[PDB]
Amino acid sequence: VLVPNLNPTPENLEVVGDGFKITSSINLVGEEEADENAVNALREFLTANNIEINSENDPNSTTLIIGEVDDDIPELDEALNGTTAENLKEEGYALVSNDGKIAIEGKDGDGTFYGVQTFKQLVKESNIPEVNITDYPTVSARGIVEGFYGTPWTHQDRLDQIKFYGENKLNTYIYAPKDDPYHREKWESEMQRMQELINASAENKVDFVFGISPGIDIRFDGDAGEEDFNHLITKAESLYDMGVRSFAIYWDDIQDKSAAKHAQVLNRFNEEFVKAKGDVKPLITVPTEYDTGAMVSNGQPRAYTRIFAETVDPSIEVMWTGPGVVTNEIPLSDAQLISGIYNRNMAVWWNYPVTDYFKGKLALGPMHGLDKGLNQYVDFFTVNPMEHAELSKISIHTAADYSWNMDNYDYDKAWNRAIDMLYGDLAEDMKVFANHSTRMDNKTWAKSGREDAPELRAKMDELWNKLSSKEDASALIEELYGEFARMEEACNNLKANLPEVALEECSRQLDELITLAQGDKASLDMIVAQLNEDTEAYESAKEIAQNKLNTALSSFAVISEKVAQSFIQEALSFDLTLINPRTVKITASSEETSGENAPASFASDGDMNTFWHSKWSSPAHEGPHHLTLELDNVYEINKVKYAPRQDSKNGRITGYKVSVSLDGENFTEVKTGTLEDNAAIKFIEFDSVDAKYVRLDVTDSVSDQANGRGKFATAAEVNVHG
Ligand SMILES: [Ca+2]
Ligand SMILES: [Ca+2]
Ligand SMILES: [Ca+2]
Hints:
alpha/beta; Methane Monooxygenase Hydroxylase, Chain G, domain 1; elongated; monomer; signal; Chitobiase, domain 2; carbohydrate binding
């Protein structure tokens, strides 16, 4: 048997044997001395997979040994054979399965728990492979930061997430926001709701962090003043009695922008609580300026960050989002900049998959853009999730592999492992849907994540290239039709089979991708209709394709803007029939550069605003004027579009003489005529004919220059069609 899909990926793993089958009843060794929470997770796993534990010793059955380095078990070390956990760092484990004996050794209590979750992933229908493993995390504090606007998570969503973190090896969870009666507002009747969260966090080796956001109405001056300050600590002390070992004070929105007053609250709280108890974990906080753009300028730091960094105690943890609030990448250079200001290892608030800024689109991509050496300056990782809790698991899954094993991380593969595991048989169909909903961008200040459906985008671009170059795309068109049908097939089967927990969060988004897919089908119909010269079917398909986009742009759900949605819009703006540049080598009789930058290049530029002008500066070239367009390859053409200078009358072509050629030296003729004097774009139409050089000899032009008739020649755009 082979190694199943693991998460996170262990540091060291090697296939020593083939594999063995697990017996229906086994015997466990080392329950009493081992971690209590680590065995509880293992005991129920055996119950769920129909496995029982023997009361007395049995040589016929398989033996599962578990414990710590602290514990002195002669059975465990013998089953290890040259393998130890003492050489590993905190929260590390060492798993070894060989010849009906599975030994697991952790460094401490936390480490042994993560050894149990690897055993659960290796076992597939009671068939565990034979491999030796030595493993340890790259980041110490890995987890989630619940801080999204809108409707908060429910209690059953939270409890489900706690268990999900432990199995995928994550040890942090921050409460807040949002509008709890106690956190911001008024910071027995609601004791249980918070109590159940802490007890479950202890069972899954996760440090429960309590958040506080008093910024909007906190006071610094006065008695009270001290009274508010005294009334800070007691709020936390109640939770310390409930079992909370981590606390935090947030400044994410404050307005009252005084770093000396914010640090005063943090620093004295660091003395009167976390060091005063001896129980407590280090203090966590978020300054008012958290993004590098708002933090530094430009850069050495702004007025706020200078005072804040130089006041706050080095022991305190500080969170920052990156180059931006919702930014694409976090390069190591940015990490060096922020960490240099604070002179400590910073904590990260990664805003993905959080969709509180762009609620329409879902975020189902991996950890994209983060530098692989981020563990150097950062030893505290947290992500901001979506308000949709079930689907937030896919990105969090990728967060586990990044934070734990950073140097070997691969975002594309870790993404595929997230969907394969969380869905099972229904993974491949979900992959197609999630593939289109990864790139977050509100077309302004927020953008992050992996690009949507790139493979499909390259092919879409490949279609417009081969359409605008005479080339036959029958093979590519056939594949596209199938690709858009695969989208509609996957989205429907998902709708017929998803657990509501998931279905209710993405029901509108499944209907959206289908509407786009159908539009993409209707888009190819137009392209086929243009190649077959079936204008009736073209307009009929155009009727459908336009409606799908209109219903898509009206519908609340948003998905695959760049790829699936934009493909419909491109098929509507495609002429073509143009070819179209650009492409190639426009040349002219005379051009202006000295007086104004308007050379012959701007004649076939594509930009409607830019124009070409004949040489009017002294010594001026007063015609006869002519444009000569070089074609990329020979093309059949039956229409020459002329867009005259819009802003000015100077040099409008009111008389032309178009010629064609295949060598560039010997031109012929195709049409001679005049054009009505105005700013309207003229279409010169003649019979289809192959050509590699398109000439436009000007026989008449006008201008507002007294006796400037025929002295000048200006063209905003000149290009051929066929
Ligand atoms: Ca112990
Ligand atoms: Ca939409
Ligand atoms: Ca132009």
